[PDB]
Write an enzyme that holds these catalytic residues in place. Structure first.
Site, PDB file in Angstrom:
ATOM      1  N   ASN A  29       0.787  -1.235   0.000  1.00 43.55           N
ATOM      2  CA  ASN A  29       0.000   0.000   0.000  1.00 43.55           C
ATOM      3  C   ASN A  29       0.822   1.290   0.000  1.00 43.55           C
ATOM      4  O   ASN A  29       0.459   2.258  -0.669  1.00 43.55           O
ATOM      5  CB  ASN A  29      -0.992  -0.001   1.166  1.00 43.55           C
ATOM      6  CG  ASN A  29      -2.115  -1.002   0.972  1.00 43.55           C
ATOM      7  OD1 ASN A  29      -2.823  -0.968  -0.036  1.00 43.55           O
ATOM      8  ND2 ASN A  29      -2.289  -1.895   1.940  1.00 43.55           N
ATOM      9  N   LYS A  83       0.103   4.931   8.941  1.00 43.48           N
ATOM     10  CA  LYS A  83      -1.281   4.476   8.769  1.00 43.48           C
ATOM     11  C   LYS A  83      -1.918   4.498  10.155  1.00 43.48           C
ATOM     12  O   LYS A  83      -1.752   3.571  10.951  1.00 43.48           O
ATOM     13  CB  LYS A  83      -1.330   3.067   8.163  1.00 43.48           C
ATOM     14  CG  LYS A  83      -2.728   2.456   8.131  1.00 43.48           C
ATOM     15  CD  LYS A  83      -2.772   1.176   7.309  1.00 43.48           C
ATOM     16  CE  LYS A  83      -2.783   1.470   5.823  1.00 43.48           C
ATOM     17  NZ  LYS A  83      -2.707   0.212   5.023  1.00 43.48           N
TER      18      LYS A  83
HETATM   19 CA   LIG Z   1       0.039  -2.516   6.829  1.00 45.92          CA
END
Ligand SMILES: [Ca+2]
Ligand SMILES: [Ca+2]
EC number: 4.2.2.2
Length: 400
Positions: free
Chosen positions: A243, A248
């Site tokens: 990703n 995150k």
């Molecule tokens: Ca991850």
């Protein structure tokens, strides 16, 4: 600072067990002239004592289709942790020997189920899955590193609480299992307990994300840390699926009121700072984000009653979307505008310069404010934010 002259690397202990890669049963661990094995020291060590590692590489044999995890199930006590450290502020690298294409489910490098461990100057590499997987509590990882593992560098999950990760690095972790879509640098996520903290850490060039707090309602605090160049395919994987986010900061609509301050994200394929569908309000104060796919991405819904809090942040050379937030004094709203001239250096190669042997992040010019920048003294006086002059400078670095 330089702690190379200190045998025990800053640790005060009542008993030292001397260990070396060639340590064996014909020795009692009374000195480096009679080193015992790591396993022997692990069997003997008690709360408040220290397993002192001779700097070098400790190789754990690999066998195809089998895990070779070292389990840390014993526990220290409050005021008496079990210390594991490389001597004279050197480095002890634990190599779990997995070939690049191989991996084994749950074959962590260090599986920490016990409490009150204190690691310093130790690294984990080539583990068959996560470098370190922590379900125990009150553990500390100082000046450590987790790299080139077949899953997330260091993960905290399944009840692990009040763990502190200080001045540590996590890089080049990649999972062949899901073509890179799983391996992060640091993973305080899912079923982790409360109180987990990261300070002065760096996470770079991991297949998936730098830091990942997916699906956890427990607050995580991240301070003075870096997340960069995550999501880049360095593995010649034709089916790469990483990703590529720096921080995150949530996932799966879990309400996680996290706090991130004086941190840096740059060169990540996706978002530098990522809401990732966190349903809760995140606190983002005095950070710098540069040349990511998206610098700050907080454009998804939150639960009614939740609101992000953004102050004194900098965005440069990429876009910002910060919705559902109490935001001001940022470079993209009421704070002064940020441009290349506001920084002494934008040479990104400086991000991975060597730490001091005690773990201290290198002092470089990267993302530091130029003397003539209007970002100096331009921020709001947020509680618990240090500053010089009249007020906090915008961004992750106070001009000193
Ligand atoms: Ca991850
Ligand atoms: Ca100032």
């Amino acid at each position: 600072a330089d702690c190379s002259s200190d045998l025990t690397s800053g640790i005060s202990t009542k008993r030292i067990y001397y260990v070396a890669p060639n340590g064996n049963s014909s020795n009692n661990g009374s000195s480096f002239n009679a080193p015992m094995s790591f396993s022997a020291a692990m069997a003997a060590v008690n709360p408040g004592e220290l397993i002192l590692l001779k700097p070098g590489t400790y190789t754990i044999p690999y066998t195809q289709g089998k895990g070779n995890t070292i389990t840390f199930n014993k526990s220290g006590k409050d005021g008496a942790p079990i210390y594991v450290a490389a001597a004279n502020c050197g480095r002890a690298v634990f190599d779990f020997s997995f070939p690049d294409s191989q991996w084994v489910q749950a074959s962590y490098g260090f599986y920490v189920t016990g409490d009150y461990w204190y690691f310093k100057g130790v690294e984990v590499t080539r583990a068959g899955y996560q470098g370190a997987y922590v379900i125990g509590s009150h553990n500390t990882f100082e000046n450590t590193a987790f790299h080139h593992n077949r899953n997330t560098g260091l993960e905290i999950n399944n009840g692990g609480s009040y763990n502190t990760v200080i001045n540590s690095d996590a890089y080049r972790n990649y999972d062949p299992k899901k073509n890179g879509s799983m391996a992060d640098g640091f993973g305080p996520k899912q079923k982790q307990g409360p109180g987990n903290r990261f300070v002065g850490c760096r996470a770079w060039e991991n297949s998936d994300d730098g830091f990942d707090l997916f699906d956890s309602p427990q607050k995580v605090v991240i301070e003075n840390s870096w997340a960069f160049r995550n999501g880049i395919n360095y593995w010649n994987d034709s089916a790469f699926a990483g990703n590529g986010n720096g921080f995150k900061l949530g996932g799966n609509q879990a309400v996680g009121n996290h706090r991130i301050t004086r941190s840096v994200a740059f060169g990540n394929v996706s978002k530098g700072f990522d809401q990732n569908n966190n349903a809760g309000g995140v606190t983002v104060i005095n950070n710098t984000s540069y040349k990511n796919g998206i610098n700050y991405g907080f454009g998804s819904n939150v639960q009614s009653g939740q609101k992000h809090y953004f102050r004194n942040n900098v965005s440069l050379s990429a876009s910002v979307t910060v919705s559902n937030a109490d935001a001001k004094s940022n470079s993209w709203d009421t704070g002064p505008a940020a441009s290349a001239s506001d920084f002494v250096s934008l040479d990104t190669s400086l991000a991975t310069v060597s730490r001091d042997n005690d773990g201290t992040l290198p002092e470089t010019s990267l993302f530091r404010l130029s003397a003539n920048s209007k970002l100096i003294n331009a921020g709001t006086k947020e509680s618990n934010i240090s500053y010089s002059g009249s007020a906090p400078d915008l961004g992750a670095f106070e001009r000193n």
